[PDB]
């Protein structure tokens, strides 16, 4: 795949998110690099408008599946890299149990040598002292698997998956994700057989950083074929 050739080394990443949750407007910018050969990415994100009005763990999945590692032994098509450099649109509904929901639309594509994820996020119907707007979630993110299927009619893929967010009182709150991806432009893409992506995330803080921020290490690996 020609798109696959763009990922054999280390690739710089830029993430830009404009958000509006219950009328609270905010922006996030992130920079880092991705190593798709190892399924690895490292990022630092900053809330550039001041205080982030939602917990950072609720934004992890919104803030580049082209950096997944697709192992040889499954020998299956990589939709996300095959769409590059022109890239793809990634859209989601994210529902939080007994609370509001996010709607997201992002374009993932090369701008020069940088893989860019540019996102528009809207949050609706949140409770002002629920776990999200009330900041009652732990600063961590559990490992999870997500099932990927081909969407033949839209020449893309879909994925419905759940995330278990840890609440400060010891319980969990489900954030259910409903995702669809479609290619940008008219280049040919590879539609995969059904498979899984497995993800792990390590969240930390920069001790010299005064702004509201998140340092992230993430691994994404394909399986099941």
Paired tokens of 120: 């528009």
97 Cβ neighbours under 8 A, 6+ residues apart: 173, 174, 175, 176
Q: Measure Cα distances from 82 to 150, 155, 156, 157 in Å.
A: 14, 12, 11, 12
CA 139/CA 168 separation, integer angstroms: 9
CA 152/CA 161 separation, integer angstroms: 20
Instruction: Measure the CA dihedral 122/124/127/131, to 10°.
Output: -40
Paired tokens of 188: 């040919």
The experimental resolution of this structure, in angstroms, equals 2.0
Which CATH fold would you assign to the domain 2-220?
Green Fluorescent Protein (2.40.155)
Q: Are 193 and 76 in contact (CB under 8 A)?
A: yes
Query: Which three-class secondary structure state does DSSP give residue 146?
Result: strand
Pairing of strands 24-35, 195-204: unpaired
Phi-psi region of 210 (alpha: psi -120 to 50; beta: other; left: phi over 0): alpha
E strands, 22-155, in order = 24-35, 40-47, 88-96, 101-111, 114-124, 144-151
Longest pairwise C-alpha distance within the chain: 49
Phi–psi pair at 169, nearest 5 degrees: -90, 5
Paired tokens of 74: 């499954």
Among residues 126, 148, 128, the alpha carbon closest in space to that of 79 is found at: 148
- Residues followed by a break in the chain (C to N exceeding 2.5 Å) are 63
Q: Are 173 and 188 in contact (CB under 8 A)?
A: no
CA 182/CA 158 separation, integer angstroms: 9
Q: What angle do CA 110, 144, 147 make, to 5 degrees?
A: 70
The b-or-e profile of 138-157 (16+ CB within 10 A means b, else e) is beebeebebebebeeeebbb
53 Cβ neighbours under 8 A, 6+ residues apart: 21, 24, 26, 133
CA 224/CA 192 separation, integer angstroms: 12
Strand partners, 124: 101
CA 66/CA 127 separation, integer angstroms: 34
CA 205/CA 34 separation, integer angstroms: 19
């Amino acid at each position: 795949s020609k798109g696959e050739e763009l990922f054999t080394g280390v690739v710089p990443i830029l993430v830009e998110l404009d958000g509006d949750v219950n009328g609270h407007k905010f922006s996030v910018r992130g920079e880092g690099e991705g190593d798709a050969t190892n399924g690895k990415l490292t990022m630092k994100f900053i809330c550039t408008t001041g205080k982030l009005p939602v917990p950072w763990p609720t934004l992890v999945t919104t803030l580049v599946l082209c950096f997944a590692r697709y192992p040889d032994h499954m020998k299956q098509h990589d939709f996300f890299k095959s769409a590059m450099p022109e890239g793809y649109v990634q859209e989601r509904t994210i529902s939080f149990e007994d609370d509001g929901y996010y709607k997201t639309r992002a374009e993932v594509k090369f701008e020069g040598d940088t893989l860019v994820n540019r996102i528009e996020l809207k949050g609706i119907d949140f409770k002002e002292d629920g776990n999200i707007l009330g900041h009652k979630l732990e600063y961590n993110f559990n490992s999870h698997d997500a099932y990927i299927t081909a969407d033949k009619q839209k020449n893309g893929i879909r994925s419905n998956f759940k995330i278990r967010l840890n609440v400060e009182d010891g319980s969990v709150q489900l954030a259910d994700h409903y995702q669809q991806n479609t290619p940008i432009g008219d280049g040919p893409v590879l539609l995969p057989d059904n498979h899984y992506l497995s993800t792990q995330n390590a969240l930390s803080k920069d001790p010299n950083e005064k702004r509201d921020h998140m340092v992230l290490l993430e691994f994404v690996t394909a399986s099941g074929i």
